[PDB]
Write a protein that binds this ligand. Structure first.
Ligand code: CL
Lengths: 316, 305
Protein backbone atom coordinates (compact mmCIF):
# COMPACT_ATOMS: atom_id res chain seq x y z
CA UNK A 1 0.00 0.00 0.00
CA UNK A 2 1.10 3.60 -0.87
CA UNK A 3 1.73 6.32 1.73
CA UNK A 4 -1.27 8.46 2.69
CA UNK A 5 -1.34 11.97 1.18
CA UNK A 6 -2.10 14.96 3.41
CA UNK A 7 -2.52 18.57 2.24
CA UNK A 8 -2.31 21.37 4.82
CA UNK A 9 -4.14 24.61 3.91
CA UNK A 10 -3.43 27.84 5.67
CA UNK A 11 -0.19 27.22 7.38
CA UNK A 12 -0.58 29.78 10.15
CA UNK A 13 0.48 29.71 13.79
CA UNK A 14 0.58 26.14 15.15
CA UNK A 15 1.11 24.54 11.72
CA UNK A 16 4.86 24.03 12.16
CA UNK A 17 4.39 21.55 15.06
CA UNK A 18 1.67 19.73 13.09
CA UNK A 19 3.96 19.59 10.03
CA UNK A 20 6.87 18.27 12.25
CA UNK A 21 4.68 15.55 13.66
CA UNK A 22 3.35 14.66 10.22
CA UNK A 23 6.91 14.30 8.92
CA UNK A 24 7.67 11.68 11.61
CA UNK A 25 4.77 9.64 10.21
CA UNK A 26 4.88 7.73 6.97
CA UNK A 27 2.97 10.32 4.81
CA UNK A 28 3.35 12.65 1.73
CA UNK A 29 2.73 16.31 2.56
CA UNK A 30 1.64 19.22 0.44
CA UNK A 31 1.05 22.74 1.75
CA UNK A 32 -1.15 25.48 0.18
CA UNK A 33 -0.54 29.13 1.22
CA UNK A 34 -1.89 32.50 0.11
CA UNK A 35 0.77 35.04 -0.96
CA UNK A 36 -1.24 38.23 -1.47
CA UNK A 37 -0.87 42.10 -1.76
CA UNK A 38 2.46 41.50 -3.31
CA UNK A 39 5.22 43.59 -4.92
CA UNK A 40 4.38 45.97 -7.79
CA UNK A 41 0.74 44.78 -7.81
CA UNK A 42 0.09 45.92 -4.15
CA UNK A 43 -0.78 49.61 -5.10
CA UNK A 44 1.69 50.94 -2.49
CA UNK A 45 4.90 52.96 -2.91
CA UNK A 46 8.07 50.79 -2.59
CA UNK A 47 9.30 52.49 0.65
CA UNK A 48 5.85 52.07 2.30
CA UNK A 49 5.76 48.25 2.22
CA UNK A 50 8.62 46.39 3.99
CA UNK A 51 4.59 37.53 6.63
CA UNK A 52 4.82 34.23 8.51
CA UNK A 53 2.53 31.72 6.77
CA UNK A 54 5.23 31.12 4.11
CA UNK A 55 8.13 31.37 6.56
CA UNK A 56 6.50 28.81 8.88
CA UNK A 57 5.82 26.30 6.09
CA UNK A 58 9.29 26.80 4.48
CA UNK A 59 11.18 26.12 7.74
CA UNK A 60 8.82 23.21 8.76
CA UNK A 61 9.35 21.44 5.39
CA UNK A 62 13.07 22.24 5.09
CA UNK A 63 15.66 19.51 5.06
CA UNK A 64 16.88 20.53 8.56
CA UNK A 65 13.97 22.10 10.47
CA UNK A 66 15.78 22.27 13.83
CA UNK A 67 18.75 23.96 12.22
CA UNK A 68 16.55 26.41 10.25
CA UNK A 69 14.29 27.28 13.25
CA UNK A 70 17.41 28.15 15.25
CA UNK A 71 18.78 30.20 12.37
CA UNK A 72 15.45 31.71 11.13
CA UNK A 73 14.71 33.18 14.60
CA UNK A 74 18.00 34.41 16.10
CA UNK A 75 17.97 38.21 16.46
CA UNK A 76 20.82 40.66 16.37
CA UNK A 77 21.48 43.05 19.29
CA UNK A 78 24.68 44.64 18.01
CA UNK A 79 21.26 47.60 12.52
CA UNK A 80 20.37 46.62 15.18
CA UNK A 81 17.87 44.15 16.78
CA UNK A 82 16.08 42.50 13.89
CA UNK A 83 15.47 38.71 13.25
CA UNK A 84 17.78 36.94 10.74
CA UNK A 85 15.75 34.80 8.34
CA UNK A 86 13.06 37.43 8.20
CA UNK A 87 15.86 39.36 6.41
CA UNK A 88 16.40 36.45 3.92
CA UNK A 89 12.74 36.36 2.84
CA UNK A 90 12.75 40.19 2.65
CA UNK A 91 15.86 40.13 0.49
CA UNK A 92 14.84 37.47 -2.02
CA UNK A 93 11.38 39.09 -2.36
CA UNK A 94 12.87 42.53 -3.07
CA UNK A 95 15.33 40.90 -5.48
CA UNK A 96 12.63 39.12 -7.52
CA UNK A 97 10.10 41.94 -7.21
CA UNK A 98 7.43 40.03 -5.28
CA UNK A 99 7.36 37.17 -2.81
CA UNK A 100 5.35 35.22 -5.39
CA UNK A 101 8.28 35.55 -7.83
CA UNK A 102 10.68 34.50 -5.02
CA UNK A 103 8.88 31.29 -4.11
CA UNK A 104 11.00 28.96 -6.25
CA UNK A 105 14.24 30.58 -4.98
CA UNK A 106 12.82 30.17 -1.42
CA UNK A 107 12.15 26.44 -1.78
CA UNK A 108 15.64 26.03 -3.19
CA UNK A 109 17.08 27.98 -0.27
CA UNK A 110 15.23 25.95 2.40
CA UNK A 111 15.71 22.68 0.48
CA UNK A 112 12.06 21.99 1.06
CA UNK A 113 10.59 18.46 0.93
CA UNK A 114 7.06 17.81 -0.44
CA UNK A 115 5.17 20.54 -2.31
CA UNK A 116 4.43 24.11 -1.27
CA UNK A 117 1.98 25.82 -3.63
CA UNK A 118 0.53 29.25 -3.76
CA UNK A 119 -3.28 29.34 -3.88
CA UNK A 120 -3.22 31.15 -7.29
CA UNK A 121 -0.81 31.83 -10.07
CA UNK A 122 -1.74 35.47 -10.30
CA UNK A 123 -1.26 38.36 -7.92
CA UNK A 124 -3.96 38.58 -5.25
CA UNK A 125 -5.32 41.26 -2.90
CA UNK A 126 -6.93 40.37 0.44
CA UNK A 127 -9.96 42.40 1.56
CA UNK A 128 -11.61 42.45 5.03
CA UNK A 129 -15.03 43.87 5.73
CA UNK A 130 -15.43 44.94 9.37
CA UNK A 131 -18.71 44.87 11.33
CA UNK A 132 -19.34 48.54 10.71
CA UNK A 133 -19.00 48.08 6.95
CA UNK A 134 -15.48 49.50 6.59
CA UNK A 135 -13.38 47.66 3.90
CA UNK A 136 -9.60 47.36 4.33
CA UNK A 137 -7.21 45.86 1.68
CA UNK A 138 -3.92 44.20 2.68
CA UNK A 139 -3.08 41.78 5.44
CA UNK A 140 -0.75 44.13 7.30
CA UNK A 141 -3.35 46.91 7.04
CA UNK A 142 -6.23 44.57 8.06
CA UNK A 143 -4.33 43.40 11.07
CA UNK A 144 -3.72 47.09 12.06
CA UNK A 145 -7.38 48.13 11.63
CA UNK A 146 -9.33 48.34 14.91
CA UNK A 147 -12.61 46.38 14.97
CA UNK A 148 -14.32 43.01 14.55
CA UNK A 149 -13.96 41.38 11.17
CA UNK A 150 -17.19 40.18 9.55
CA UNK A 151 -15.86 38.66 6.31
CA UNK A 152 -12.88 38.43 3.90
CA UNK A 153 -12.55 38.11 0.14
CA UNK A 154 -9.82 38.04 -2.43
CA UNK A 155 -9.52 39.82 -5.77
CA UNK A 156 -6.96 39.85 -8.54
CA UNK A 157 -4.44 42.66 -8.01
CA UNK A 158 -4.14 43.34 -11.77
CA UNK A 159 -7.72 43.06 -13.07
CA UNK A 160 -11.43 42.55 -12.40
CA UNK A 161 -11.35 38.83 -13.38
CA UNK A 162 -12.44 36.14 -10.94
CA UNK A 163 -9.39 34.78 -9.03
CA UNK A 164 -8.35 31.22 -10.12
CA UNK A 165 -6.56 28.43 -8.32
CA UNK A 166 -3.08 27.48 -9.34
CA UNK A 167 -4.55 24.06 -10.64
CA UNK A 168 -1.81 21.75 -9.52
CA UNK A 169 -3.66 23.03 -6.37
CA UNK A 170 -7.03 21.56 -7.49
CA UNK A 171 -5.45 18.24 -8.43
CA UNK A 172 -3.65 18.12 -5.09
CA UNK A 173 -6.86 18.61 -3.08
CA UNK A 174 -8.71 16.04 -5.17
CA UNK A 175 -5.99 13.39 -4.92
CA UNK A 176 -5.40 13.80 -1.14
CA UNK A 177 -6.47 11.35 1.55
CA UNK A 178 -6.90 14.18 4.07
CA UNK A 179 -7.07 17.91 4.05
CA UNK A 180 -6.02 19.75 7.25
CA UNK A 181 -7.35 23.29 7.49
CA UNK A 182 -5.33 25.25 9.93
CA UNK A 183 -4.32 25.74 12.46
CA UNK A 184 -3.76 29.47 11.80
CA UNK A 185 -5.56 32.77 12.02
CA UNK A 186 -9.04 32.26 10.50
CA UNK A 187 -9.33 35.55 8.65
CA UNK A 188 -5.77 36.12 7.51
CA UNK A 189 -4.38 32.55 7.09
CA UNK A 190 -7.12 30.00 6.42
CA UNK A 191 -10.05 31.89 4.78
CA UNK A 192 -8.10 33.59 1.94
CA UNK A 193 -7.49 30.11 0.48
CA UNK A 194 -11.03 28.84 0.62
CA UNK A 195 -12.67 31.93 -0.88
CA UNK A 196 -11.08 31.17 -4.26
CA UNK A 197 -13.85 29.40 -6.15
CA UNK A 198 -11.82 26.60 -7.69
CA UNK A 199 -10.39 25.71 -4.26
CA UNK A 200 -13.87 25.86 -2.63
CA UNK A 201 -15.14 23.49 -5.35
CA UNK A 202 -12.22 21.05 -4.87
CA UNK A 203 -12.91 20.97 -1.13
CA UNK A 204 -16.57 20.21 -1.81
CA UNK A 205 -15.80 17.45 -4.32
CA UNK A 206 -12.74 15.76 -2.87
CA UNK A 207 -12.89 12.24 -1.55
CA UNK A 208 -10.36 13.37 1.12
CA UNK A 209 -11.46 13.65 4.76
CA UNK A 210 -11.53 17.43 5.59
CA UNK A 211 -10.28 18.10 9.14
CA UNK A 212 -10.25 21.55 10.80
CA UNK A 213 -7.84 22.17 13.65
CA UNK A 214 -9.30 25.01 15.68
CA UNK A 215 -7.37 27.77 17.41
CA UNK A 216 -6.28 27.56 21.04
CA UNK A 217 -6.82 31.32 21.47
CA UNK A 218 -8.92 34.13 20.05
CA UNK A 219 -7.17 36.56 17.75
CA UNK A 220 -7.14 40.28 17.07
CA UNK A 221 -10.35 41.14 15.23
CA UNK A 222 -12.26 38.41 17.07
CA UNK A 223 -14.65 38.78 20.03
CA UNK A 224 -14.30 37.21 23.50
CA UNK A 225 -17.17 34.79 22.84
CA UNK A 226 -16.14 33.75 19.31
CA UNK A 227 -16.61 30.03 20.00
CA UNK A 228 -15.16 27.02 18.24
CA UNK A 229 -18.65 26.49 16.78
CA UNK A 230 -18.59 30.09 15.50
CA UNK A 231 -15.24 29.48 13.81
CA UNK A 232 -16.79 26.51 11.89
CA UNK A 233 -19.76 28.69 11.07
CA UNK A 234 -17.59 31.46 9.51
CA UNK A 235 -15.60 28.87 7.49
CA UNK A 236 -18.86 27.35 6.15
CA UNK A 237 -20.32 30.78 5.36
CA UNK A 238 -17.22 31.86 3.48
CA UNK A 239 -17.04 28.75 1.33
CA UNK A 240 -20.78 28.86 0.84
CA UNK A 241 -21.86 25.50 2.23
CA UNK A 242 -21.01 23.14 5.03
CA UNK A 243 -17.82 21.19 4.18
CA UNK A 244 -15.84 20.25 7.34
CA UNK A 245 -15.99 16.49 8.07
CA UNK A 246 -13.95 16.45 11.33
CA UNK A 247 -13.17 19.30 13.78
CA UNK A 248 -10.50 19.03 16.50
CA UNK A 249 -10.88 21.47 19.41
CA UNK A 250 -8.81 21.95 22.56
CA UNK A 251 -10.71 21.77 25.86
CA UNK A 252 -7.75 21.72 28.25
CA UNK A 253 -7.75 24.97 30.31
CA UNK A 254 -5.08 27.58 29.70
CA UNK A 255 -4.52 28.88 33.29
CA UNK A 256 -5.06 32.61 33.87
CA UNK A 257 -1.82 32.69 35.91
CA UNK A 258 0.09 31.47 32.84
CA UNK A 259 -1.44 34.14 30.59
CA UNK A 260 -0.70 36.89 33.24
CA UNK A 261 2.89 35.68 33.98
CA UNK A 262 3.66 35.33 30.28
CA UNK A 263 2.30 38.81 29.42
CA UNK A 264 -0.34 37.64 26.88
CA UNK A 265 -2.27 40.39 25.00
CA UNK A 266 -4.86 40.92 27.74
CA UNK A 267 -7.79 40.66 25.31
CA UNK A 268 -6.97 37.29 23.77
CA UNK A 269 -8.81 34.47 25.55
CA UNK A 270 -9.06 30.72 25.30
CA UNK A 271 -11.46 29.75 22.49
CA UNK A 272 -14.83 29.11 24.15
CA UNK A 273 -16.30 25.67 23.62
CA UNK A 274 -19.80 25.01 22.23
CA UNK A 275 -20.32 21.27 21.79
CA UNK A 276 -23.96 21.50 20.69
CA UNK A 277 -23.13 24.05 17.99
CA UNK A 278 -20.16 21.95 16.75
CA UNK A 279 -22.33 18.80 16.56
CA UNK A 280 -25.06 20.60 14.56
CA UNK A 281 -22.44 21.47 11.92
CA UNK A 282 -19.77 18.71 11.74
CA UNK A 283 -20.19 14.86 11.77
CA UNK A 284 -17.16 14.08 13.83
CA UNK A 285 -16.24 16.42 16.70
CA UNK A 286 -13.04 15.63 18.63
CA UNK A 287 -12.71 17.58 21.93
CA UNK A 288 -9.56 16.70 23.86
CA UNK A 289 -6.37 18.02 25.37
CA UNK A 290 -4.36 19.37 22.41
CA UNK A 291 -2.58 22.07 24.43
CA UNK A 292 1.15 22.66 24.91
CA UNK A 293 2.11 25.38 27.43
CA UNK A 294 5.73 26.04 26.59
CA UNK A 295 7.97 28.90 25.33
CA UNK A 296 5.82 31.59 27.03
CA UNK A 297 2.59 30.62 25.19
CA UNK A 298 -0.44 28.41 24.67
CA UNK A 299 0.21 26.41 21.56
CA UNK A 300 -0.99 23.30 19.81
CA UNK A 301 0.48 19.97 20.74
CA UNK A 302 1.45 18.60 17.34
CA UNK A 303 1.72 14.94 18.33
CA UNK A 304 -1.60 14.75 20.24
CA UNK A 305 -3.26 16.33 17.12
CA UNK A 306 -1.52 14.18 14.59
CA UNK A 307 -2.16 10.96 16.62
CA UNK A 308 -5.91 11.70 16.25
CA UNK A 309 -5.52 12.42 12.55
CA UNK A 310 -3.56 9.19 11.92
CA UNK A 311 -6.24 7.21 13.81
CA UNK A 312 -8.94 8.49 11.41
CA UNK A 313 -7.02 8.68 8.16
CA UNK A 314 -7.97 6.25 5.42
CA UNK A 315 -6.33 5.76 2.00
CA UNK A 316 -9.03 6.83 -0.56
CA UNK B 1 41.17 2.92 -8.88
CA UNK B 2 40.44 5.23 -5.91
CA UNK B 3 39.48 8.91 -6.48
CA UNK B 4 42.45 11.19 -6.03
CA UNK B 5 42.49 13.36 -2.91
CA UNK B 6 43.32 17.00 -3.57
CA UNK B 7 43.81 19.60 -0.83
CA UNK B 8 43.66 23.26 -1.84
CA UNK B 9 45.45 25.78 0.44
CA UNK B 10 44.85 29.54 0.19
CA UNK B 11 42.81 31.30 -2.52
CA UNK B 12 41.80 34.77 -3.79
CA UNK B 13 39.40 35.44 -6.73
CA UNK B 14 41.31 33.03 -7.52
CA UNK B 15 40.48 29.74 -5.77
CA UNK B 16 36.76 29.72 -6.79
CA UNK B 17 37.80 29.22 -10.42
CA UNK B 18 40.15 26.32 -9.48
CA UNK B 19 37.61 24.76 -7.11
CA UNK B 20 34.90 24.99 -9.83
CA UNK B 21 37.08 23.14 -12.34
CA UNK B 22 38.19 20.55 -9.75
CA UNK B 23 34.55 19.80 -8.90
CA UNK B 24 34.02 18.81 -12.55
CA UNK B 25 36.68 16.09 -12.12
CA UNK B 26 36.34 12.83 -10.19
CA UNK B 27 38.32 13.86 -7.11
CA UNK B 28 37.82 14.29 -3.36
CA UNK B 29 38.46 17.93 -2.38
CA UNK B 30 39.61 19.43 0.93
CA UNK B 31 40.03 23.19 1.35
CA UNK B 32 42.15 24.80 4.09
CA UNK B 33 41.45 28.49 4.82
CA UNK B 34 42.81 31.08 7.31
CA UNK B 35 40.38 32.57 9.82
CA UNK B 36 41.41 35.91 11.43
CA UNK B 37 39.74 37.85 14.36
CA UNK B 38 36.49 36.36 2.94
CA UNK B 39 38.65 33.57 1.61
CA UNK B 40 36.33 31.49 3.85
CA UNK B 41 33.34 33.09 2.07
CA UNK B 42 34.57 32.31 -1.43
CA UNK B 43 35.41 28.65 -0.51
CA UNK B 44 31.97 28.17 1.15
CA UNK B 45 30.16 29.39 -2.01
CA UNK B 46 32.60 27.48 -4.30
CA UNK B 47 32.04 24.17 -2.43
CA UNK B 48 28.26 24.67 -1.96
CA UNK B 49 25.49 22.62 -3.59
CA UNK B 50 24.45 25.68 -5.73
CA UNK B 51 27.36 28.10 -6.22
CA UNK B 52 25.67 30.40 -8.81
CA UNK B 53 22.58 30.64 -6.58
CA UNK B 54 24.51 31.45 -3.43
CA UNK B 55 26.77 33.89 -5.29
CA UNK B 56 23.71 35.87 -6.48
CA UNK B 57 21.97 35.60 -3.12
CA UNK B 58 25.06 36.40 -1.18
CA UNK B 59 25.78 39.63 -3.05
CA UNK B 60 22.34 41.21 -3.55
CA UNK B 61 22.18 44.44 -1.57
CA UNK B 62 19.05 45.85 -0.12
CA UNK B 63 17.78 48.78 -2.22
CA UNK B 64 17.44 52.47 -1.49
CA UNK B 65 13.82 51.81 -0.56
CA UNK B 66 14.71 49.33 2.24
CA UNK B 67 15.00 52.14 4.82
CA UNK B 68 17.32 51.11 7.66
CA UNK B 69 18.72 48.04 5.87
CA UNK B 70 19.38 49.92 2.58
CA UNK B 71 22.66 49.01 0.91
CA UNK B 72 23.68 46.05 3.05
CA UNK B 73 24.47 42.74 1.33
CA UNK B 74 22.33 39.70 2.17
CA UNK B 75 25.22 37.22 2.49
CA UNK B 76 27.24 39.39 4.85
CA UNK B 77 24.10 39.66 6.97
CA UNK B 78 23.95 35.82 7.08
CA UNK B 79 27.66 35.29 7.82
CA UNK B 80 27.60 38.02 10.48
CA UNK B 81 24.41 36.66 12.12
CA UNK B 82 25.62 33.07 12.44
CA UNK B 83 29.00 34.51 13.67
CA UNK B 84 27.26 36.48 16.44
CA UNK B 85 25.03 33.50 17.35
CA UNK B 86 28.19 31.38 17.86
CA UNK B 87 30.46 34.09 19.37
CA UNK B 88 32.83 34.25 16.38
CA UNK B 89 33.17 33.40 12.70
CA UNK B 90 35.68 30.71 13.78
CA UNK B 91 33.03 29.27 16.16
CA UNK B 92 30.43 29.27 13.28
CA UNK B 93 32.39 27.16 10.75
CA UNK B 94 30.42 23.92 11.11
CA UNK B 95 27.07 25.78 10.76
CA UNK B 96 28.30 27.78 7.79
CA UNK B 97 29.12 24.54 5.93
CA UNK B 98 25.86 22.84 6.93
CA UNK B 99 23.90 25.75 5.52
CA UNK B 100 25.76 25.84 2.14
CA UNK B 101 25.38 22.04 1.89
CA UNK B 102 29.10 21.97 1.11
CA UNK B 103 30.67 19.01 -0.63
CA UNK B 104 34.17 17.83 0.44
CA UNK B 105 35.74 19.26 3.60
CA UNK B 106 36.50 22.85 4.61
CA UNK B 107 39.05 23.22 7.48
CA UNK B 108 40.26 26.36 9.23
CA UNK B 109 44.07 26.20 9.23
CA UNK B 110 44.49 26.80 12.99
CA UNK B 111 43.02 25.71 16.29
CA UNK B 112 42.01 29.34 17.13
CA UNK B 113 41.38 32.66 15.32
CA UNK B 114 44.60 34.41 14.25
CA UNK B 115 46.24 37.80 13.82
CA UNK B 116 48.53 38.25 10.81
CA UNK B 117 51.77 40.18 11.34
CA UNK B 118 54.08 41.58 8.64
CA UNK B 119 57.64 42.80 8.93
CA UNK B 120 58.48 45.39 6.24
CA UNK B 121 61.83 45.89 4.62
CA UNK B 122 62.60 48.99 6.68
CA UNK B 123 62.00 46.98 9.87
CA UNK B 124 58.49 48.28 10.53
CA UNK B 125 56.03 45.81 12.15
CA UNK B 126 52.31 45.90 11.36
CA UNK B 127 49.56 43.69 12.90
CA UNK B 128 46.24 42.95 11.17
CA UNK B 129 45.56 42.19 7.58
CA UNK B 130 43.90 45.46 6.61
CA UNK B 131 46.67 47.45 8.25
CA UNK B 132 49.31 45.39 6.41
CA UNK B 133 47.80 45.97 2.92
CA UNK B 134 47.44 49.68 3.72
CA UNK B 135 51.05 50.14 4.93
CA UNK B 136 53.40 51.83 2.45
CA UNK B 137 56.41 49.60 1.85
CA UNK B 138 57.75 46.25 0.74
CA UNK B 139 56.86 43.23 2.90
CA UNK B 140 59.87 41.16 3.97
CA UNK B 141 58.00 38.44 5.93
CA UNK B 142 54.79 37.45 7.69
CA UNK B 143 53.92 35.31 10.71
CA UNK B 144 50.73 34.58 12.65
CA UNK B 145 49.75 34.66 16.33
CA UNK B 146 46.53 33.71 18.13
CA UNK B 147 44.33 36.79 18.52
CA UNK B 148 43.43 36.01 22.17
CA UNK B 149 46.71 34.69 23.61
CA UNK B 150 50.52 34.30 23.19
CA UNK B 151 50.57 30.56 22.54
CA UNK B 152 51.96 29.01 19.35
CA UNK B 153 49.16 28.60 16.77
CA UNK B 154 48.50 24.94 16.15
CA UNK B 155 46.76 23.17 13.26
CA UNK B 156 43.07 22.48 13.74
CA UNK B 157 41.70 18.91 14.03
CA UNK B 158 42.25 16.76 10.92
CA UNK B 159 44.36 19.30 8.95
CA UNK B 160 47.72 17.49 9.39
CA UNK B 161 46.17 14.08 8.64
CA UNK B 162 44.46 15.54 5.54
CA UNK B 163 47.75 16.96 4.22
CA UNK B 164 49.61 13.69 4.89
CA UNK B 165 46.92 11.55 3.28
CA UNK B 166 46.56 13.75 0.16
CA UNK B 167 47.55 12.74 -3.40
CA UNK B 168 48.16 16.41 -4.24
CA UNK B 169 48.31 19.78 -2.44
CA UNK B 170 47.58 22.82 -4.54
CA UNK B 171 48.95 26.08 -3.15
CA UNK B 172 47.32 29.18 -4.54
CA UNK B 173 46.51 30.99 -6.57
CA UNK B 174 46.00 34.08 -4.30
CA UNK B 175 47.93 36.82 -2.56
CA UNK B 176 51.13 35.27 -1.32
CA UNK B 177 51.36 37.36 1.87
CA UNK B 178 47.75 37.52 2.95
CA UNK B 179 46.15 34.37 1.51
CA UNK B 180 48.78 31.62 1.03
CA UNK B 181 51.53 32.23 3.58
CA UNK B 182 49.32 32.62 6.64
CA UNK B 183 48.31 28.93 6.23
CA UNK B 184 51.78 27.56 5.83
CA UNK B 185 53.49 29.60 8.57
CA UNK B 186 51.50 27.52 11.13
CA UNK B 187 54.32 25.30 12.22
CA UNK B 188 52.38 22.05 12.20
CA UNK B 189 51.11 22.75 8.69
CA UNK B 190 54.62 23.56 7.45
CA UNK B 191 55.90 20.31 8.90
CA UNK B 192 53.01 18.40 7.31
CA UNK B 193 53.87 19.95 3.93
CA UNK B 194 57.58 19.02 4.28
CA UNK B 195 56.76 15.42 5.19
CA UNK B 196 53.76 14.60 3.00
CA UNK B 197 54.25 12.30 0.04
CA UNK B 198 51.59 14.36 -1.80
CA UNK B 199 52.77 16.15 -4.92
CA UNK B 200 52.95 19.85 -3.93
CA UNK B 201 51.85 22.17 -6.77
CA UNK B 202 52.01 25.96 -6.70
CA UNK B 203 49.89 28.09 -9.05
CA UNK B 204 51.59 31.42 -9.40
CA UNK B 205 49.80 34.80 -9.64
CA UNK B 206 49.04 36.54 -12.92
CA UNK B 207 49.68 40.06 -11.53
CA UNK B 208 51.94 41.66 -8.88
CA UNK B 209 50.20 42.81 -5.61
CA UNK B 210 50.47 45.45 -2.80
CA UNK B 211 53.57 44.96 -0.65
CA UNK B 212 55.49 43.53 -3.66
CA UNK B 213 58.02 45.08 -6.04
CA UNK B 214 57.42 45.42 -9.81
CA UNK B 215 60.27 42.95 -10.47
CA UNK B 216 58.82 40.29 -8.16
CA UNK B 217 59.17 37.40 -10.67
CA UNK B 218 57.41 34.02 -10.61
CA UNK B 219 60.75 32.62 -9.38
CA UNK B 220 60.83 35.14 -6.50
CA UNK B 221 57.32 33.95 -5.43
CA UNK B 222 58.71 30.44 -5.02
CA UNK B 223 61.77 31.71 -3.14
CA UNK B 224 59.51 33.52 -0.63
CA UNK B 225 57.32 30.41 0.01
CA UNK B 226 60.42 28.26 0.51
CA UNK B 227 61.99 30.79 2.81
CA UNK B 228 58.88 31.00 5.04
CA UNK B 229 58.67 27.23 5.40
CA UNK B 230 62.49 27.10 5.79
CA UNK B 231 63.29 24.49 3.13
CA UNK B 232 62.40 23.82 -0.51
CA UNK B 233 59.17 21.84 -0.71
CA UNK B 234 57.31 22.69 -3.98
CA UNK B 235 57.36 19.83 -6.55
CA UNK B 236 55.49 21.45 -9.44
CA UNK B 237 55.04 25.13 -10.37
CA UNK B 238 52.53 26.36 -12.91
CA UNK B 239 53.19 29.84 -14.39
CA UNK B 240 51.29 31.92 -17.01
CA UNK B 241 53.30 33.34 -19.90
CA UNK B 242 50.44 34.88 -21.93
CA UNK B 243 50.60 38.70 -22.07
CA UNK B 244 47.92 40.76 -20.38
CA UNK B 245 47.44 43.49 -23.04
CA UNK B 246 48.07 47.10 -21.90
CA UNK B 247 44.94 48.38 -23.76
CA UNK B 248 42.97 45.79 -21.76
CA UNK B 249 44.45 47.07 -18.48
CA UNK B 250 43.71 50.73 -19.36
CA UNK B 251 40.08 50.00 -20.44
CA UNK B 252 39.27 47.98 -17.28
CA UNK B 253 40.77 50.52 -14.88
CA UNK B 254 43.76 48.50 -13.54
CA UNK B 255 46.03 49.96 -10.82
CA UNK B 256 49.09 51.39 -12.67
CA UNK B 257 51.83 50.52 -10.10
CA UNK B 258 50.86 46.78 -10.33
CA UNK B 259 52.30 44.97 -13.39
CA UNK B 260 52.05 41.43 -14.80
CA UNK B 261 54.36 38.97 -13.00
CA UNK B 262 57.71 38.65 -14.81
CA UNK B 263 58.71 35.16 -15.97
CA UNK B 264 62.10 33.75 -14.90
CA UNK B 265 62.47 30.14 -16.13
CA UNK B 266 66.06 29.59 -15.08
CA UNK B 267 65.36 30.73 -11.50
CA UNK B 268 62.20 28.58 -11.36
CA UNK B 269 64.11 25.50 -12.63
CA UNK B 270 66.84 26.02 -10.01
CA UNK B 271 64.21 25.70 -7.27
CA UNK B 272 61.52 23.29 -8.49
CA UNK B 273 61.72 20.01 -10.43
CA UNK B 274 58.76 20.47 -12.66
CA UNK B 275 58.08 23.91 -14.19
CA UNK B 276 55.01 24.31 -16.41
CA UNK B 277 54.89 27.60 -18.36
CA UNK B 278 51.84 28.00 -20.55
CA UNK B 279 48.74 30.11 -21.24
CA UNK B 280 46.68 30.07 -18.08
CA UNK B 281 45.22 33.55 -18.72
CA UNK B 282 41.51 34.35 -19.01
CA UNK B 283 40.61 38.04 -19.85
CA UNK B 284 36.89 38.06 -19.06
CA UNK B 285 34.94 40.16 -16.55
CA UNK B 286 37.09 43.27 -16.76
CA UNK B 287 39.95 41.26 -15.20
CA UNK B 288 43.14 39.31 -15.83
CA UNK B 289 42.14 35.98 -14.26
CA UNK B 290 43.38 32.41 -14.05
CA UNK B 291 41.73 29.96 -16.45
CA UNK B 292 40.66 27.21 -14.05
CA UNK B 293 40.10 24.47 -16.63
CA UNK B 294 43.51 24.85 -18.22
CA UNK B 295 45.23 24.82 -14.84
CA UNK B 296 43.16 21.86 -13.58
CA UNK B 297 43.75 19.95 -16.88
CA UNK B 298 47.51 20.25 -16.26
CA UNK B 299 47.21 19.13 -12.59
CA UNK B 300 45.02 16.11 -13.49
CA UNK B 301 47.61 15.12 -16.14
CA UNK B 302 50.38 15.09 -13.41
CA UNK B 303 48.44 13.37 -10.67
CA UNK B 304 49.17 9.76 -9.61
CA UNK B 305 47.21 7.73 -6.97
CL1 CL C 1 -4.15 29.74 18.69
Amino acid sequence: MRKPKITVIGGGTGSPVILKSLREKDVEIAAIVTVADDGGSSGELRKNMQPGDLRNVLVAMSDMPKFYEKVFQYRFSEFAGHPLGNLIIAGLSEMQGSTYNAMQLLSKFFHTTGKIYPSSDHPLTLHAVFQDGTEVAGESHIVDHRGIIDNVYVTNALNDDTPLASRRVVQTILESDMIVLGPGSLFTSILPNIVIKEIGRALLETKAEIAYVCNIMTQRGETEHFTDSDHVEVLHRHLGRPFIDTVLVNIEKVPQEYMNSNRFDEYLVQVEHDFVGLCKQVSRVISSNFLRLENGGAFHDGDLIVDELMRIIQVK
